Symmetry: none
Subunit: 209 residues, 3 copies
C-alpha cells in the first residue's frame, strides 16, 4: 500500500522547512554510523539529530526489528536517504547556483568509492545514495543500473536487487523492462561503465607483486 | 515576520497530516471537531501554552496556539497544524472521500454537520462541494471545493458586513500552481461564471418553520 | 574535404583561447545570424570581426560569389567559429560544476530558447542547438544530430540539410555512429528532446481567449 511518491511529499511536509545542504552533508557522511547506533540501540523508535535536525526514525536495524511491519509514512533510515537524495536533486534541477553550492559541501561516499564525483552529473552522483531507487524517474534509472554493475564487476547478491526491480516507474507502466523502453535504461548502463571503479595504486614494488 | 507565505504550500502539509492522523480518522471525529471548533478556539485563547494538544472524539492532536493574544502575530512552522488548517485539512479529507466512491458520502450525511454552513440553511442536498466549502480554512484548497471558499468570503463581504481585510488571505492562493488567479483566466473560470449559488442560497438563518405569529418579517 | 574538425578547434584555441571568456562568448551568440549580413555585404575574402574585445578574422563565404571558393582548414568560418565556441563553453563547464552556473547567466542561445530547451534540460542539449555543434557530437552527446532530425520530423525541413550532419565520425569506425551502442546513445538523445515540447516561447502568460494558444 506504501506510496513512495507520497512519503517524500509527506517527508518534505514535516522536515522540509529545516533542510539545507549542511545537514545533508552530515547525514550522508554519517549514515553508516547511524546504521550502527540503530543496530545497537533497542528502541523501535529513535530520535536522530543530523546537524540541528532532528529526525524521528523507525529502528529496523536492531536484530529483532529486521522484519517488522513498517508503517507507510514512517521515515526509516533508508527511506530518509532516498528523500534526502530526491531533495538535493530538486534543488539542482531548479536553480543552477544551488547545484554548484551543493557540489562544494555534500559528498556521496558510495559514489567516491567506485569513483563517480559530481563531474559526471548529479543524477548519477546522487544516485549512489541508498533509497534513490524509490525515485527511478527522478534519477534517470541510475539506481537500477548502479546495482546491476555491482552485480557484474563486483558480485553482490542477485537477491539484493529484487527490491529495486519492483520500484515502478511513472504512471501506467509497472517499470519491468519493455514497459518503459529499455533504451533509456540501456543508456544509463553504458554511462556508468564509462567511470569504472578500482582502488590502487600508482607505484610498482620491485620487491614483488 | 511579515509577508507573505514563504512556505507553504498546504497540499504537502495536508498529505503529511494524513500521515500523522489519517490511520485513525473517521467521520465521527469530524462531527465532534467541526462542532467543537468554536469552543476549542476559546480554550486555546484561555490556556498559556504555545502549542497544545486536544482530543476530539478520540484523537489526539497537537495543535498550534493562534488565538491566545500573545501568540497571534508569532510565526508558525509548516508541519505545525493550526486549528484553522486543521479545519481546512479535515474539510478536504471529507471532500476527497466523497469524491472517491459515493458510499462514504452517506456516512458524512448522517454524521458530519457544518455550523457555519447551517446558519445559511445549506445541507448535503447542495452537493458536498458547496457545503464543505463553508468550513474555515477551506480556501487553502480552492479546487477541492470548486472556488466556493473564495466566493463565500466574497459573498458575505457584500451581502453582509465584512472587510476586504479577509480577502488578502483568500487571494495569494494558488489554483494548482496558477499564474493569473486574481479573477483572471479564460471563460471567467468558475469563480462567478459557474456558482451563482451563494447568490441563490438565501440569507436564511430563519431558525424555525412558521412560526407565522406576531412578528414583522419574516 | 581534408580537415578533421578536432584539428581546427585546437588551432582556434591557440589564437584566441588565451583571451576567450564567457563574456566574449555572449556577444557572438547574440550577433550570430546578424553577422551573416556584415560578410555578405562587404566584398572582402576575410574580415576582422569584433565580439566584445576579441577580435577574430572571419573568412568569407557568405558572399554570393564566394560559394565557388573552397575553404582552407586552418581558416575559420562563422559556422566553424560558432561550433568551436559551442565546444569551448561545454568543454569548460565539463570541468568543475562551479563554472557551469557562470554560463547559465552570461550566455544565451537563440536557437534552443525558441524550440523550448533552456539550460534546465542540460547544457549538452542547450549548447547543442548551435551551428557547427555537429562537428562535435562526441562532446554534445549526439544532440546536434538529434535536433536536426527533429526539425525535419515533426515540423518540416529538407532532409538534404541532414546530409551534412550524417558525415561526422563519432571517433573512428567510424562515420557511424549508426549502431554500436546501441545504436549510439541516439534515441535516448532523440526522444529526450521529444520530452520537451515544441511550445514556441516569447509572450507573457497570458489567457486567450478569442483565438490562438
Amino acid at each position: 500500500t506504501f506510496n513512495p511518491e507520497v512519503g517524500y511529499v509527506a517527508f518534505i511536509g514535516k522536515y522540509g522547512q529545516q533542510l539545507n545542504f549542511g545537514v545533508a552533508r552530515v547525514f550522508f557522511l554519517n549514515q553508516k554510523k547511524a546504521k550502527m547506533v540503530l543496530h545497537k540501540t533497542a528502541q523501535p523508535s529513535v530520535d536522530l539529530t543530523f546537524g540541528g535536525v532532528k529526525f524521528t526514525v523507525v529502528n529496523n536495524h536492531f536484530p529483532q526489528y529486521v522484519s517488522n511491519p513498517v508503517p507507510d509514512n514512517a521515515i526509516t533510515l533508508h527511506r530518509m536517504s532516498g528523500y534526502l537524495a530526491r531533495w538535493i536533486a530538486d534543488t539542482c534541477k531548479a536553480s543552477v547556483l544551488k547545484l554548484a553550492e551543493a557540489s562544494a559541501q555534500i559528498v556521496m561516499p558510495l559514489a567516491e568509492v567506485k569513483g563517480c564525483t559530481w563531474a559526471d552529473g548529479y543524477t548519477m552522483y546522487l544516485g549512489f545514495a541508498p533509497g534513490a531507487e524509490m525515485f527511478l524517474d527522478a534519477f534517470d534509472f541510475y539506481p537500477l543500473v548502479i546495482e546491476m554493475h555491482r552485480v557484474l564487476k563486483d558480485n553482490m547478491d542477485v537477491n539484493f536487487m529484487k527490491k529495486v526491480l519492483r520500484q515502478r516507474y511513472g504512471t501506467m507502466t509497472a517499470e519491468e523492462w519493455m514497459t518503459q523502453k529499455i533504451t533509456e535504461i540501456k543508456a544509463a548502463f553504458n554511462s556508468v561503465g564509462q567511470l569504472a571503479w578500482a582502488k590502487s595504486g600508482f607505484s610498482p614494488a620491485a620487491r614483488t607483486f
